[PDB]
Amino acid sequence: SKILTLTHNVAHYGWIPFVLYLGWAHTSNRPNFLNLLSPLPSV
Amino acid sequence: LTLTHNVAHYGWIPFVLYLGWAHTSNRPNFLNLLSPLPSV
Amino acid sequence: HSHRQSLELVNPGTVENLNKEVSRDVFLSQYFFTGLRADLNKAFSMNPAFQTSHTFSIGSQALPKYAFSALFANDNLFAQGNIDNDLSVSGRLNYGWDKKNISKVNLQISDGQPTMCQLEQDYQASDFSVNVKTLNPSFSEKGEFTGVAVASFLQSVTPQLALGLETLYSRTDGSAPGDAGVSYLTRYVSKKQDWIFSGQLQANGALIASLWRKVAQNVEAGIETTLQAGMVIQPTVEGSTTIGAKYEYRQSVYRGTLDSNGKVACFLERKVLPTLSVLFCGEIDHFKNDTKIGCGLQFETAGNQELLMLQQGLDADGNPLQ
Amino acid sequence: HSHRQSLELVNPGTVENLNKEVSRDVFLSQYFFTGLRADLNKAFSMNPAFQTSHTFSIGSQALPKYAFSALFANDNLFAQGNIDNDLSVSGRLNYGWDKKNISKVNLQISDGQPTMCQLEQDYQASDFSVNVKTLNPSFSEKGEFTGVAVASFLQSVTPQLALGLETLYSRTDGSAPGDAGVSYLTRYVSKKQDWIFSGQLQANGALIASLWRKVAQNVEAGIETTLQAGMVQPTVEGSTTIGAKYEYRQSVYRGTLDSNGKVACFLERKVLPTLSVLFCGEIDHFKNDTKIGCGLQFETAGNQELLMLQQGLDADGNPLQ
Amino acid sequence: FQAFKESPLYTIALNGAFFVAGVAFIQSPLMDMLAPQL
Amino acid sequence: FQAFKESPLYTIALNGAFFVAGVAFIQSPLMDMLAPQL
Amino acid sequence: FVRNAFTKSGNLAWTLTTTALLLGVPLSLSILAEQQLIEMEKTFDLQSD
Amino acid sequence: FVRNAFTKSGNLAWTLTTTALLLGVPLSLSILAEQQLIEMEKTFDLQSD
Amino acid sequence: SEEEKRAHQEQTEKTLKQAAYVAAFLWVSPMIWHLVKKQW
Amino acid sequence: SEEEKRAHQEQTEKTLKQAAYVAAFLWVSPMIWHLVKKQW
Ligand SMILES: CCCCCCCCCCC
Ligand SMILES: CCCCCCCCCCC
Ligand SMILES: CCCCCCCCCCC
């Protein structure tokens, strides 16, 4: 695709957002971005 | 006694051990005095 | 070909798990670290298994200064990502077409260095196990394979004995002919399954032998011997022998090791809380007169109230398990 | 000398203990080590106080690999010996003529090295303290003193304020004339005795100021500032450190921050009545390195009475109080 | 300015400020909140 | 022989003897004695 | 300069986190052991009556 | 030759002692914690009957 | 030169084919063991 | 250089005598401060 040809040297930084989104779409609580990224017991 | 000056400092720790040993009521033996194990 | 079910052979393990009980359970090579370490991890789900992690380290050459991770795993998928403080990204993707057929992809991308890749296909049949993988594949102009390809096969010849072999093929530059190498494998498990023997006869002249034994319900023991042959125009054989034991309880795991080169080591994990444990490892090399110390901690949290209560043990409304 | 007894002054302590509470109780410079360590003590008496010790160590430059020690101490005598691996023998001998007049000897004899000696006389009056100390004395054939000689004086001028001074005289070579230096001291203890200030004006241009405070019955705190003067053109070298100590029934914690970027901690946990486990760790944020030490201490006894007493069950009788 | 940062007076001023602020923190009631009641 | 001690057969025999002695010790009841009843 | 402002904040967060962990974990263990001793002695005093 | 044998014996006793200390102190701590857990469970069993 | 590459390639191809034959014999082997054990 | 050493020795002797003088003044200090506090 054109997007894959335009961005190839920075396309590997979107892998960990994809794993975070895949985990987030299966949770019943569905926490926010800072709750996903923080190590504290956010609940 | 003045010609043994070079090795006379190895008798200080036996003197402290004897000073302690003469004041104990138990009076343990030499191997027990030098043994870390409880060893009453 | 009719009495295989009459023979009633079971599937052996994988070639990767040939000496798992000695190498990765009793011995402390996979657990030893140096310096100070802190690993904080959080769990958001349990049946689709979503987790994140943070790692802090100082005083070691292997571990990064900081790393962030995330993993997701349902019954036929496993994804993982990881990024360091030098901005190196690692990925992983296992997909199981069945419970006997798994395809694995493993990438590693860092700036200023070439991209590392690794592909693998695993197949576990009723009484044998095949595994073919490929480390750093590439192709030339004419269409010649470059990099190293490994294939292995393991077969149960009797309900306790297993025999196998493993082939290798490395062609580094692509303007030279490739190499080859064949290993030979053996694994014998006792009838009571209380001791396991495993031996290898590798392509690079090595020879590894291992023995595991389960002493009590809390104590295991192991011994491993490695002999490696080489050249200086003269023969040269380098040998080693390691012996160890593992004691596991409800609140602590202990591992201790002796070596024939004059090294003694220990590893202790001490669970001072249901969500907090303290690690200690120490070594003494009696041949060189030096030591290594590591101290660390592990902290587990949760991302919702049900998981918080379950990992505390209070369960629903302060009523524990039964 | 008529109204001193109406003034009602007290003894101001010693010069050596001028900042004892900050420097040797709250801070962890005397306790920090690196590597692995083990101490095995053994007691034979309590009122005449006879003890032995064994020490094992690996991974540090300060500690020796092995050392054996023994000490004896009654109400007016103190003897101590110590031998390491490689055969370095060290000795110590105090003797109190009175309860306030102590003479001290201190020898250290190692092979291939000159003998080190140190003499000291300590005197504590009703409202002042004197201390004369000679480090490595020598005399030539002509009759010239060679070595270091220190004399101190500390006077209580108020029930809370103490002032004093310290004089040094060092003549190393014996051919060139020696040099002298004068320090000035100050110690102020509060009226309720919950905070203490100490200050020094050293002969090397240094300036040390300290403050101690007892926050609760288990918590103490401290802060110390050092300014050094050097000629590298004048240069000033300085550090400021702050710390706290938490004492409980079976654990002592010490933790320290520093203005050069270092943090450190020290923990001693008594896992048994006769066993302790020590941990100390340091992170230097300016240089990005670390130090770790782990060790243990074991205390035993040499007779049944002391063995039962340190276990806590005094024979058939109850522990009671 | 940047000429004052290389002067020897900067170390003296910085360590004096550190000592005064630390003494004021230690004698404050903020130090009492760091002692647990147990 | 000291000439035997320079051979690779010395290391082979030493590690083989260590392995068979360790296997005999592990399968002996001394290893059962090394596990406390608790 | 924006990324130069971000990198120093990341390093500052790393230093604050590791300083707080090293100074705080052993003190927390000490306070936990003291709380368990107080609870055990209170249960003994309740068993006395 | 007697002093060399004494040197070898002392240098062997040091290695045996430090090996025994490093291997046996954390195992002893682990066994001690297990015994205290079993004793606490026995007190809970005595309270539960 | 070039003539030593053919010997190396022939030897490596021979090694790979020998490994394949050993794997086939290993797959056959349980029935052979059963036949020998039932005969004796 | 013997006349250079006499200035150094004179200076160190003067330093020691000045230290003795301020020690004597420190000993007589509490009565002086008591008189000042009582008069003031
Ligand atoms: C090397 C000194 C050991 C002790 C000697 C003193 C013995 C005193 C005997 C009193 C009759
Ligand atoms: C009585 C001899 C041992 C004590 C030392 C006294 C001298 C004091 C130090 C030198 C002035
Ligand atoms: C040659 C391998 C080891 C032989 C001995 C096995 C253990 C037998 C039981 C020992 C009591």
Are β-strands D128-139 and D145-156 bridged in parallel, bridged antiparallel, or unpaired?
antiparallel
CA distance C115 to chain A (A): 11
I15 lies in which domain range?
A: 1-40
Tokens, residue J10 = 């004179």
Q: What kind and span of H or E run contains D202?
A: none
The beta strand positions in H1-49, using DSSP E, are: none
DSSP assignment of C218-272: SEEEEEEEEEEEEE---EEEEEEEEEEEEEE-SSEEEEEEEETTSEEEEEEEEEE
Number of domains forming the structure of chain B: 1
Any chain E CB within 8 A of the CB of G31? Answer: yes
Is the Cβ–Cβ distance between C177 and I8 less than 8 Å? yes
Report the alpha-carbon distance of residue G14 to residue D283 in Å, rounded.
12
- Burial of D284 from C-beta contacts in 10 A (0-12 / 13-18 / 19+): middle
Q: Which of D155, D179, D184 to mutate to test the interface with J (most CBs of J within 10 A)?
A: D155
Would the CB of F27 count as within 6 Å of ligand 3?
yes
CB–CB contact F19 C225 (8 Å):
yes
Number of domains forming the structure of chain I: 1
User: Residue D234, Cβ neighbours under 10 Å: how many?
Assistant: 9
Number of domains forming the structure of chain G: 1
Residue of C nearest to A23 (CA): C50
Q: How far are the Cα atoms of D3, D57, D133, D162, D250 from residue C264, in angstroms, in the given order?
A: 72, 15, 48, 56, 31
Tokens, residue C279 = 């690690």
Q: Is D303 helix (H, G, I), strand (E, B) or coil?
A: coil
Tokens, residue D185 = 């001291």
DSSP assignment of J1-40: -HHHHHHHHHHHHHHHHHHHHHHHHHHHHHHHHHHHHHH-
CB–CB contact C272 G18 (8 Å):
no
CB–CB contact I30 C156 (8 Å):
yes
Q: How far is ligand 1, taken at its centre, from the CA of residue F35, in Å?
A: 49
Q: Is D285 helix (H, G, I), strand (E, B) or coil?
A: coil
CB–CB contact D269 G29 (8 Å):
yes
Q: What is the DSSP letter of F22?
A: H
User: Residue D205, Cβ neighbours under 10 Å: how many?
Assistant: 13
Q: What is the largest distance, in Å, between two alpha-carbon atoms of chain J?
A: 56
Q: Which residue has tokens 């200390």? A: H21
* CB contact set of I34 (below 8 Å; sequence gap of 6+): C3, C7
Report the alpha-carbon distance of residue C66 to residue C85 in Å, rounded.
5
Among candidates C63, D85, D152, which has minimal Cα distance to H18?
Answer: D85
Among candidates C87, C145, C148, which has minimal Cα distance to C117?
Answer: C148
**What's the CA dihedral at I6, I11, I12, I16 to 10 degrees?**
140
Query: Domain limits of chain E?
Result: 2-34
Q: How far is ligand 1, taken at its centre, from the CA of residue B11, in Å?
A: 10
Phi-psi region of G15 (alpha: psi -120 to 50; beta: other; left: phi over 0): alpha
CB–CB contact D48 B20 (8 Å):
yes
Could you tell me how many CB contacts below 8 A there are between chain D and chain G? 40
- What is the Rg, in whole angstroms, of the alpha carbon atoms belonging to chain C? 23
Among candidates H27, F26, F33, H34, which has minimal Cα distance to C247?
Answer: H27
Would the CB of F30 count as within 6 Å of ligand 3?
no
Q: What is the DSSP letter of A12?
A: G
Report the alpha-carbon distance of residue B28 to residue B24 in Å, rounded.
8
The one-letter code for the residue type at H43 is: T
Is the Cβ–Cβ distance between C184 and C168 less than 8 Å? no
Tokens, residue D25 = 């109780």
- Burial of C225 from C-beta contacts in 10 A (0-12 / 13-18 / 19+): buried
Q: How far are the Cα atoms of C42, C97, I24, J5 from residue C101, in angstroms, in the given order?
A: 31, 6, 21, 95
Report the alpha-carbon distance of residue D196 to residue D22 in Å, rounded.
9
Please, what's the b/e burial string for C101-126 (b: 16 or more CB within 10 A of its CB; e: otherwise)?
A: ebebebbbbeeeeeeebbbbebebee
Among candidates D135, D107, D136, D103, which has minimal Cα distance to D121?
Answer: D103
The beta strand positions in D194-250, using DSSP E, are: 195-201, 207-214, 219-231, 234-247
Report the alpha-carbon distance of residue C165 to residue C155 in Å, rounded.
9
Q: How far are the Cα atoms of C236, C237, D57 from residue C232, in angstroms, in the given order?
A: 6, 10, 38
The one-letter code for the residue type at D204 is: N
Would the CB of B16 count as within 6 Å of ligand 1?
no
What residues pair up with D245 in beta bridges, in sequence order? D220, D254
What residues pair up with C38 in beta bridges, in sequence order? C56, C297
Q: How far are the Cα atoms of B39, D46, G8, G19, J14 from residue D289, in angstroms, in the given order?
A: 44, 44, 19, 13, 49
B22 lies in which domain range?
A: 1-40
Nominal resolution (angstroms): 2.9
